[PDB]
Design a protein around this motif. Structure first.
Motif, PDB file in Angstrom:
ATOM      1  N   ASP A 198      37.293  12.835   8.501  1.00  0.00           N
ATOM      2  CA  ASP A 198      36.818  11.583   7.918  1.00  0.00           C
ATOM      3  C   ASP A 198      37.841  10.472   8.151  1.00  0.00           C
ATOM      4  O   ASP A 198      37.609   9.567   8.952  1.00  0.00           O
ATOM      5  CB  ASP A 198      36.570  11.765   6.418  1.00  0.00           C
ATOM      6  CG  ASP A 198      35.960  10.495   5.833  1.00  0.00           C
ATOM      7  OD1 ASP A 198      34.752  10.345   5.924  1.00  0.00           O
ATOM      8  OD2 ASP A 198      36.709   9.690   5.304  1.00  0.00           O
ATOM      9  N   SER A 199      38.970  10.542   7.452  1.00  0.00           N
ATOM     10  CA  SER A 199      40.030   9.558   7.633  1.00  0.00           C
ATOM     11  C   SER A 199      41.381  10.144   7.230  1.00  0.00           C
ATOM     12  O   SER A 199      41.509  10.761   6.173  1.00  0.00           O
ATOM     13  CB  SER A 199      39.738   8.313   6.794  1.00  0.00           C
ATOM     14  OG  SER A 199      40.026   8.589   5.430  1.00  0.00           O
TER      15      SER A 199
ATOM     16  N   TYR B   2      46.035  11.691   2.344  1.00  0.00           N
ATOM     17  CA  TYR B   2      45.443  12.886   2.941  1.00  0.00           C
ATOM     18  C   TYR B   2      44.292  13.402   2.081  1.00  0.00           C
ATOM     19  O   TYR B   2      44.167  13.038   0.912  1.00  0.00           O
ATOM     20  CB  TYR B   2      46.515  13.970   3.102  1.00  0.00           C
ATOM     21  CG  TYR B   2      47.027  14.533   1.795  1.00  0.00           C
ATOM     22  CD1 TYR B   2      46.401  15.645   1.218  1.00  0.00           C
ATOM     23  CD2 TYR B   2      48.127  13.943   1.162  1.00  0.00           C
ATOM     24  CE1 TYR B   2      46.875  16.165   0.008  1.00  0.00           C
ATOM     25  CE2 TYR B   2      48.601  14.464  -0.048  1.00  0.00           C
ATOM     26  CZ  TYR B   2      47.975  15.575  -0.625  1.00  0.00           C
ATOM     27  OH  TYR B   2      48.442  16.089  -1.817  1.00  0.00           O
ATOM     28  N   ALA B   3      43.456  14.252   2.669  1.00  0.00           N
ATOM     29  CA  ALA B   3      42.291  14.775   1.963  1.00  0.00           C
ATOM     30  C   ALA B   3      42.092  16.256   2.268  1.00  0.00           C
ATOM     31  O   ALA B   3      42.549  16.756   3.296  1.00  0.00           O
ATOM     32  CB  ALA B   3      41.042  13.996   2.381  1.00  0.00           C
ATOM     33  N   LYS B   4      41.406  16.951   1.367  1.00  0.00           N
ATOM     34  CA  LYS B   4      41.135  18.373   1.554  1.00  0.00           C
ATOM     35  C   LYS B   4      40.394  18.622   2.867  1.00  0.00           C
ATOM     36  O   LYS B   4      40.624  19.628   3.535  1.00  0.00           O
ATOM     37  CB  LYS B   4      40.300  18.902   0.385  1.00  0.00           C
ATOM     38  CG  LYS B   4      40.155  20.421   0.503  1.00  0.00           C
ATOM     39  CD  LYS B   4      39.253  20.937  -0.619  1.00  0.00           C
ATOM     40  CE  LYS B   4      39.240  22.467  -0.601  1.00  0.00           C
ATOM     41  NZ  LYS B   4      40.533  22.981  -1.136  1.00  0.00           N
ATOM     42  N   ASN B   5      39.495  17.711   3.226  1.00  0.00           N
ATOM     43  CA  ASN B   5      38.751  17.834   4.475  1.00  0.00           C
ATOM     44  C   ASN B   5      39.643  17.483   5.662  1.00  0.00           C
ATOM     45  O   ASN B   5      40.839  17.244   5.503  1.00  0.00           O
ATOM     46  CB  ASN B   5      37.536  16.902   4.453  1.00  0.00           C
ATOM     47  CG  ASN B   5      36.573  17.316   3.345  1.00  0.00           C
ATOM     48  OD1 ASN B   5      36.574  18.470   2.915  1.00  0.00           O
ATOM     49  ND2 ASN B   5      35.745  16.436   2.853  1.00  0.00           N
TER      50      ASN B   5
END
Length: 177
Positions: free
Chosen positions: A71-72, A77-80
């Motif tokens: 995603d981005s 930061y992100a889990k994905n």
């Protein structure tokens, strides 16, 4: 082609996970899982395993990976948005009756492709006997965990449902359809 319902609390309400198998070679098996989002009606995540087996040394060796959609990524930061891969041995030992336990384990190492993070895991469910209650309701305990230095969550079987707790205050049920 089997389907299982996964319930979640303090994270996600409901999610579907289904499992499929494919024959690639005489001694190579394809085993993968598709997770359909909580929204219901779209992908969510994918995982797959490539495995080979040995006869006398009753066991299998293979690698497992999972893909989370991008995603981005930048300042935050992100889990994905992340790919991970691991290689391990799978072994099962029934030591009940004569003993008191029974386990199915994944023994190996995983790396996160996102930040050079490497861990080893007791990627297993270890059957042990604890209760010590007046009630005669038998329960079986196994740590749905990667044991080494990461995170354990417990899995228990009661009646005919499988439910779990993770140190992050997360819990779930797994029930076959």
């Amino acid at each position: 082609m089997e389907t299982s319902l996964r319930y979640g609390g303090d994270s996600k309400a409901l999610k579907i996970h289904a499992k499929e198998k494919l024959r690639i070679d005489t001694n190579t098996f394809f085993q993968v899982r598709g997770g359909l989002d909580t929204k219901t009606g779209q992908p969510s995540s994918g995982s797959a395993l490539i495995r080979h087996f040995y006869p006398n040394f009753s066991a299998t060796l293979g690698v497992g990976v999972r893909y989370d959609k991008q995603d981005s990524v930048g300042v935050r930061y992100a889990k994905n948005d992340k790919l991970r891969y691991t290689v391990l041995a799978k072994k099962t030992f029934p030591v009940t009756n004569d003993g008191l336990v029974n386990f199915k384990i994944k023994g190996g190492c995983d790396v996160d492709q996102d930040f050079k993070e490497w861990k080893s895991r007791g990627g297993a469910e270890f059957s042990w006997n604890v209760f010590n209650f007046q009630k005669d309701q038998d329960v079986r305990l196994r740590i749905g965990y990667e044991a080494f230095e990461q995170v354990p969550y417990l899995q228990i079987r009661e009646n005919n449902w499988t439910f779990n707790a993770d140190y992050k205050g997360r819990w779930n049920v797994r029930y076959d359809l």
